[PDB]
């Protein structure tokens, strides 16, 4: 670990420099150090986790969508002949981005979930593990099916907890539900599913809404928006 | 499809 | 290295994929590959390395004025400690900027500068040496002053090949004016000599227009304009 | 501080 000589409050320090500077491979480099130290994550330290490495698979993703797009041009009616280079650097930016996957599943296995502390950070590292699986499965084609079960189980599990521990309009339950509900539509091919998960979301954090403050209110129904948002699309 | 933003 | 096997067509396909993808580090590994293989470059393939080595460097100076920023703030008057930090990260994004200004001018000194005969790629090769010196100046304090010089330088070479053998309207020889006066005026301490540059630039380039067709003088007036908005900033 | 050429 490039990181193992470092002070875990230095680590958290630099990955709020790095934020400022967005630099956010850095971000994410100092903050798996903060991980490695083996100590559990305050909310705040858990959200630059989180932003640091949605930051660099975000730009991994969007680079390989342009290449993926390219790659299908090259082979259609859309005639001349290219050869190996679009794939072969598709392939490079998809070895990359799996790689930051399975980094941060790594630092989510050994030991974030089991040590996380209450159900906030359990179901917000669990909701991670569901992404970060799905992110695979975007650029998957075996190994898809073995990485498209373990995204179910990690979501699964979330959701479990969430309506045990969590009330129907919590943002981080609802957060859970939309990104579940996308990975049934969009990678399981389980439409219904998706529309089933995301209305019986909608509807049990609407029968709450009065009970909220102005601001809570707020936050509950942005999330209600976009379940709403994807329920149209899919409806 | 959108994910969670943010 | 790790491009010796690829053959240069290929590399700078894929220089040009990394740059649809806004992947520059990429796009500027691709670039030295190709540049590796020995063959001039191209008017086309010169500014793909221009352009690839631009936004890597670019990334490294913001995030370095954003840290120093802080940097500075830290070591202000009436300000408590927080530890070697902040000082430990600026100098490892520091270090990071000098190593890719040192890639650019090795390049330039090891293959392009002077196996370069035609005006065009002299003058651009060695404007590219003024401003990558004229990088690692603004991070200097020395050493500075030789960095300095070395930047003047390689301009002023470029200066006296552009003024003998280029038109005043040139794009290649407007820019280089450009940035030296930029130089004169940020580095070099000589606002009087980048407001002189600036002005004769300008008034010899305005005289010639009416020779260009209007692509090219669009080209030209693109670059005039910046100069003027320089000449206004400045006076 | 002073813009040098973007292109
Ligand atoms: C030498 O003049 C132009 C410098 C760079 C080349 C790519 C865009 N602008």
Not at chain 1, 13 to 30: C, I, N, V
Not at chain 1, 204 to 223: F, G, N, P, Q, W
Request: hydrophobic letters at 35%.
């Amino acid at each position: 670990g490039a990181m193992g000589s470092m002070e875990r409050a230095s680590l958290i320090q630099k990955a709020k420099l790095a934020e400022q500077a967005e630099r956010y491979e850095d971000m994410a480099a100092f903050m798996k150090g903060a991980v490695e130290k083996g100590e559990e994550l305050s909310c705040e330290e858990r959200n630059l986790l989180s932003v640091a490495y949605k930051n660099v698979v975000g730009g991994q993703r969007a680079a390989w969508r342009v290449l993926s797009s390219i790659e299908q041009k090259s082979n259609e009616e859309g005639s001349e002949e290219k050869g190996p280079e679009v794939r072969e650097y598709r392939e490079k930016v998809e070895t990359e981005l799996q790689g930051v996957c399975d980094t941060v599943l790594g630092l989510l296995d050994s030991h974030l979930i089991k040590e996380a502390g209450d159900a906030e950070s359990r179901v917000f590292y669990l909701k991670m593990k569901g992404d970060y699986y799905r992110y695979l499965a975007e650029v998957a084609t075996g190994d898809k099916k073995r990485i498209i079960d373990s995204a179910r189980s990690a979501y699964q599990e979330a959701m479990d907890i969430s309506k045990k521990e969590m009330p129907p309009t919590n943002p981080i339950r609802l957060g859970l539900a939309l990104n579940f509900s996308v990975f049934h539509y969009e990678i399981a091919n389980s439409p219904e599913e998706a529309i089933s998960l995301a209305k019986t979301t909608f509807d049990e954090a609407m029968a709450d809404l009065h009970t909220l403050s102005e601001d809570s209110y707020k936050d509950s129904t942005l999330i209600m928006q976009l379940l709403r948002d994807n329920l149209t699309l899919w409806t | 499809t959108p994910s969670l933003p943010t």
